[PDB]
Amino acid sequence: SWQTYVDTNLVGTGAVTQAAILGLDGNTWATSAGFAVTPAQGTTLAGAFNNADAIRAGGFDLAGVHYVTLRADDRSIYGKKGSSGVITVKTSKAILVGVYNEKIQPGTAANVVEKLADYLIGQGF
Fold this sequence. Notes:
actin monomer binding; 7 strands; Beta-Lactamase
């Protein structure tokens, strides 16, 4: 279930506060209650997986928070807003978004999203 991935496999682990799963068209597949990645925000993310020009210099927006880009490649885009941040990992057909707060070890949030991506690819996603 897409809802389960988000609730249980991401948020449920406590390494991430809010999580969403998107489509390469930037449309949300499932989201944690109260977390909202807009289409517009979504289409920008996807786009950056292709060309990270925009994003590398201007940062990006996820549900009202503007993050500055720490890392951007074909598989991973990392955002940081002070002691907070977001880990996005593009899979074959989807994009994982794992937002974390100052109460979470960044190293841990990244390792959890990155590993769920690995498991999801292996399933055909």
